[PDB]
Amino acid sequence: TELQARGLTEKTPDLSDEDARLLTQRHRVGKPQFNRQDHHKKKRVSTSWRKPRGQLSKQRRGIKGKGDTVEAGFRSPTAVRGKHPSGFEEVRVHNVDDLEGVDGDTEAVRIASKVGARKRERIEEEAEDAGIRVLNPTYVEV
Amino acid sequence: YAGLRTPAESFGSGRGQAHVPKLDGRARRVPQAVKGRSAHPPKTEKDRS
Amino acid sequence: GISYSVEADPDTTAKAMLRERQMSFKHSKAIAREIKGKTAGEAVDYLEAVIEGDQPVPFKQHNSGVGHKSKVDGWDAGRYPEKASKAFLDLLENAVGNADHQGFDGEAMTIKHVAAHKVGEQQGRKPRAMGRASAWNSPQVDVELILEEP
Amino acid sequence: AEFDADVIVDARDCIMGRVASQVAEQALDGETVAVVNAERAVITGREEQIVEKYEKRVDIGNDNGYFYPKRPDGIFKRTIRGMLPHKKQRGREAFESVRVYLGNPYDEDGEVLDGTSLDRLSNIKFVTLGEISETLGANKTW
RNA sequence: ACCCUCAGAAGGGAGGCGAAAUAGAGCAUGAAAUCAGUUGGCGAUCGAGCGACAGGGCAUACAAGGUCCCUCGACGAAUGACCGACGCGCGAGCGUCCAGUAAGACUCACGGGAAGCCGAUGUUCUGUCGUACGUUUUGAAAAACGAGCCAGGGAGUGUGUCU
RNA sequence: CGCUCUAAUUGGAUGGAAGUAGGGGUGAAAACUCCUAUGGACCGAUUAGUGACGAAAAUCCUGGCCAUAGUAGCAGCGAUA
RNA sequence: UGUCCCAACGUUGGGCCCGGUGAACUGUACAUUCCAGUGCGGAGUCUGGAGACACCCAGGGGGAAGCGAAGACCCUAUGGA
Ligand SMILES: [Cl-]
Ligand SMILES: [Cl-]
Ligand SMILES: [Cl-]
Ligand SMILES: [Cl-]
Ligand SMILES: [Cl-]
Ligand SMILES: [Cl-]
Ligand SMILES: [Cl-]
Ligand SMILES: [Mg+2]
Ligand SMILES: [Mg+2]
Ligand SMILES: [Mg+2]
Ligand SMILES: [Mg+2]
Ligand SMILES: [Mg+2]
Ligand SMILES: [Mg+2]
Ligand SMILES: [Mg+2]
Ligand SMILES: [Mg+2]
Ligand SMILES: [Mg+2]
Ligand SMILES: [Mg+2]
Ligand SMILES: [Mg+2]
Ligand SMILES: [Mg+2]
Ligand SMILES: [Mg+2]
Ligand code: NA
Ligand code: NA
Ligand code: NA
Ligand code: NA
Ligand code: NA
Ligand code: NA
Ligand code: NA
Ligand code: NA
Ligand code: NA
Ligand code: NA
Ligand code: NA
Ligand code: NA
Ligand code: NA
Ligand code: NA
Ligand code: NA
Ligand SMILES: [Sr+2]
Ligand SMILES: [Sr+2]
Ligand SMILES: [Sr+2]
Ligand SMILES: [Sr+2]
Ligand SMILES: [Sr+2]
Ligand SMILES: [Sr+2]
Ligand SMILES: [Sr+2]
Ligand SMILES: [Sr+2]
Ligand SMILES: [Sr+2]
Ligand SMILES: [Sr+2]
Ligand SMILES: [Sr+2]
Ligand SMILES: [Sr+2]
Ligand SMILES: [Sr+2]
Ligand SMILES: [Sr+2]
């Protein structure tokens, strides 16, 4: 009568104290948008980042208010870089065999979008049985 | 000779237009022109072995 | 052309459309805007009075150079677009007719939805001085109308 | 017409600019201030030079306009406006919480703000707002 | 096809076919510029590189993010008191002790709470900074040059020889 | 980092591929990825290659489109109809 | 002898309002400005003040160093005729 998602949807990974701290830091600090200079002034200029190269460029010269420029100083902590907000490390999966070798305490699986409903159903039941959470679960009425 | 079969000429300064070779009011020959030549296309003379 | 841009319950609604009409699109926006919410019958009497010159149609957007009209309410500029009005009368005639064929009281139904859309331009060319010709086009207008029970 | 002032200031024998400064400060802190006996407010210096300055402000102008007040009422109100960011939301709010009156329209007497008092027995080089207004051509309605 | 409407082989309505007519004739898909109607936010007393970063309002079906707030407690870097006591200074005020104490960003734990609620997204308001971009130039917001807008197109390639 | 096609190894798709629209997650970033709707047939990854491989600009090119604007003109001529 | 003092009245066609038809020039963006100042010394956009409720009609053109033409003048090019 209601929709429910298949699998270990609420599962959380177990992280060292230092990892939980850094994951929390990444989340607290965040980062600037880093959109291309003046993307908002012209529709033909997309948001995709491009180093400002104008000799007179205000953003390039680092004028406060013109937006931050991509620099290595903005990189996130090595120990957490790339983790899903839950703390899990993601593993891309295309079939049941891709589930092999995956540690459900430390990793969560993300089924590629191309995968069909028939193959997804098999992957989903096998993942749950292996104690692995599926980040993009199928919702069925139960 | 692709794109070069035309006597298109530029009008130069004076008509408020970019100096682009044109023929019958249509731009031609140059690489930035639609129907113009390919600037640095594949070449037969290239040794591919 | 267009497709009705709004949902309509077939059991309490009647529809009609005009296609590629060659009339002022700017005038059509003004007329639609003005008759929406009116009863089909009210719309008709209003448009006939517009054509007769007794009731002006408020020109709130396409008003450059348009002289003020005292009968315009809450606004200043207005005119009497008779051509587009007659096209709207054809539309209303079609709508109310469809309505009555369905068992509804056509004239009494409310104009729930009415909007004009520019579907194109019939292209034309006009010779000008100095050996050049410039565009001389006709707008093409589609208009949708949805009548609904009171 | 009834001004619920949290503070009533008596400008009689008080240096205009000093009162104006404390009143702007109070209004920005949320205080509703009524200045009274404006015609008796005082401004130090040589009368002839002070008058020249105010006359110049009256003579200035053009099509865009430079409407400068002539009554002590308005002279004082303007003096206060120049100490408030009247074009900003908070500034206009404060400014509109201040009103200046000729004479004292209230039953209460106003208080004399500390540091704004002028001692006539020790000063001869000063002028009264009312005197300035009359010189400017105002209609001595007070 | 049939029917209704209409001056009507038009168009419209209803209807029939097909998995699909939002496949009905330049008839696969259907971006942007942009137009009509409309939803959210702002709006007829107020100011202009249109934003970046902070922080408030209002708005939010699901899914793909799940956090967030307050009491208290633990930890506690640089920094770092009030009060009181004593002693100096014409005075504003200072010194010594209390004391490197109380406090101190982050993080965590107990207890309580939030689900438009936290993030996010749209818009708007406040604060700080802020006169596009590219080019020419010693010096560009420039009253120096270029572009109406969007999509697509648009510039180190080959042979031979040399290093 | 991204694009094309080739090869080897290895996967996805009518139980719905690519593309497109809106939205969620990741990466300092190029850009990667998922969800929903549309769509209705193709699509990847890794490794070694290939190159007519990346645009905001050139009074750049072609196409489409908005404001201009319901504005100018539809008067002027010895033929005022 | 209205060229002038010194302008007036009138006539026809426009102009203005209404139906129909219906372009072009031009457009980096923003833009209700004014006075000063500053700045590559000639600013609607920077700074300080002043003024400024929104929209629309008609007008004569002060400003946008207005639009229209890669200055004709001058110089320069181991340019042309
Ligand atoms: Cl790195
Ligand atoms: Cl139009
Ligand atoms: Cl004035
Ligand atoms: Cl202000
Ligand atoms: Cl004295
Ligand atoms: Cl921490
Ligand atoms: Cl190169
Ligand atoms: Mg953009
Ligand atoms: Mg070609
Ligand atoms: Mg007019
Ligand atoms: Mg000719
Ligand atoms: Mg199609
Ligand atoms: Mg491999
Ligand atoms: Mg391209
Ligand atoms: Mg460039
Ligand atoms: Mg005009
Ligand atoms: Mg000029
Ligand atoms: Mg030149
Ligand atoms: Mg010469
Ligand atoms: Mg010669
Ligand atoms: Na040819
Ligand atoms: Na060859
Ligand atoms: Na309008
Ligand atoms: Na009116
Ligand atoms: Na009226
Ligand atoms: Na003084
Ligand atoms: Na004045
Ligand atoms: Na907000
Ligand atoms: Na240049
Ligand atoms: Na520049
Ligand atoms: Na300049
Ligand atoms: Na144009
Ligand atoms: Na051009
Ligand atoms: Na005469
Ligand atoms: Na002018
Ligand atoms: Sr899919
Ligand atoms: Sr020339
Ligand atoms: Sr308008
Ligand atoms: Sr103070
Ligand atoms: Sr049908
Ligand atoms: Sr200003
Ligand atoms: Sr401590
Ligand atoms: Sr383009
Ligand atoms: Sr669309
Ligand atoms: Sr290319
Ligand atoms: Sr147009
Ligand atoms: Sr005539
Ligand atoms: Sr003529
Ligand atoms: Sr004129």
From Swiss-Prot, chain A:
Compositional bias ranges of the Basic residues kind: 38-64
**Single GO term (MF):** nucleotide binding
Q: Does the keyword RNA-binding apply?
A: yes
Q: Which residue windows does the record flag with biased composition (Basic and acidic residues)?
A: 8-21
Q: One cellular component GO annotation, for this chain's record?
A: cytosolic large ribosomal subunit
Transmembrane parts of this sequence: none
A single BP term in Gene Ontology: DNA repair
Region annotated Disordered sits at 1-87
Q: Which UniProt keywords apply?
A: Ribonucleoprotein, Ribosomal protein, RNA-binding, rRNA-binding
* Cysteine disulfide partners in this protein: none
Purpose: Binds to the 23S rRNA.
**Which protein family is it in?**
Belongs to the eukaryotic ribosomal protein eL32 family.
Subunit-structure text: Part of the 50S ribosomal subunit. Interacts weakly with protein L15.
Kindly provide the name given to this protein in its UniProt entry.
Large ribosomal subunit protein eL32
Swiss-Prot record, chain B:
Region of interest (Disordered), residue spans:
1-49
Instruction: Name the residue ranges with Basic and acidic residues bias.
Output: 42-49
Similarity section: Belongs to the universal ribosomal protein uL4 family.
> Self-association or partners: how does it assemble?
Part of the 50S ribosomal subunit. Interacts weakly with proteins L18e, L24 and L37e. Has been cross-linked to L18e.
Q: What exactly does this protein do?
A: One of the primary rRNA binding proteins, this protein initially binds near the 5'-end of the 23S rRNA. It is important during the early stages of 50S assembly. Makes multiple contacts with different domains of the 23S rRNA in the assembled 50S subunit.
The protein, known as: Large ribosomal subunit protein uL4
UniProtKB/Swiss-Prot annotation, chain C:
A Pfam family reported for this protein in Swiss-Prot or TrEMBL: Ribosomal_L22
One Gene Ontology cellular component term attached to this UniProt record is: cytosolic large ribosomal subunit
Does the UniProt entry include the keyword Iron?
Answer: no
GO terms in the biological process aspect are: cytoplasmic translation
Instruction: Name the UniProt key words of this record, in alphabetical order.
Output: Ribonucleoprotein, Ribosomal protein, RNA-binding, rRNA-binding
Could you tell me one molecular function GO term of this UniProt entry? rRNA binding
Similarity section: Belongs to the universal ribosomal protein uL22 family.
What subunit structure does UniProt give?
Part of the 50S ribosomal subunit. Contacts the macrolide antibiotic tylosin in the polypeptide exit tunnel.
The record's PANTHER family line, in alphabetical order, gives: 60S RIBOSOMAL PROTEIN L17
The entry's function note states: This protein binds specifically to 23S rRNA. It makes multiple contacts with different domains of the 23S rRNA in the assembled 50S subunit and ribosome. Contacts all 6 domains of the 23S rRNA, helping stabilize their relative orientation. An extended beta-hairpin in the C-terminus forms part of the polypeptide exit tunnel, in which it helps forms a bend with protein L4, while most of the rest of the protein is located at the polypeptide exit tunnel on the outside of the subunit.
UniProt protein name: Large ribosomal subunit protein uL22
Source species, please? Haloarcula marismortui (strain ATCC 43049 / DSM 3752 / JCM 8966 / VKM B-1809)
Phylogenetic classification of the source organism: Archaea, Methanobacteriati, Methanobacteriota, Stenosarchaea group, Halobacteria
Curated annotation (Swiss-Prot), chain D:
Q: Which GO terms describe its molecular function?
A: mRNA binding; rRNA binding; structural constituent of ribosome
- SUPFAM superfamilies for this protein: Ribosomal protein L13 (SSF52161)
Q: Which GO terms describe its biological process?
A: negative regulation of translation; translation
- UniProt KW Ribosomal protein keyword: yes
Gene Ontology cellular component? Answer: cytosolic large ribosomal subunit
The record's section on InterPro entries has:
Ribosomal_uL13, Ribosomal_uL13_bac-type, Ribosomal_uL13_CS, Ribosomal_uL13_euk/arc, Ribosomal_uL13_sf
- Source superkingdom: Archaea
Among PROSITE patterns, the record links this protein to: RIBOSOMAL_L13 (PS00783)
What single Pfam family name could you report for this chain, choosing any that match?
A: Ribosomal_L13
Q: Which UniProt keywords apply?
A: Ribonucleoprotein, Ribosomal protein, RNA-binding, rRNA-binding
In UniProt terms, what function does this protein have?
A: This protein is one of the early assembly proteins of the 50S ribosomal subunit. Binds to 23S rRNA.
Q: Which family does the record claim for this protein?
A: Belongs to the universal ribosomal protein uL13 family.
| Quaternary context | Part of the 50S ribosomal subunit. Interacts weakly with proteins L3 and L6.
Identification of the protein by name: Large ribosomal subunit protein uL13
Species for this entry = Haloarcula marismortui (strain ATCC 43049 / DSM 3752 / JCM 8966 / VKM B-1809) (Halobacterium marismortui)
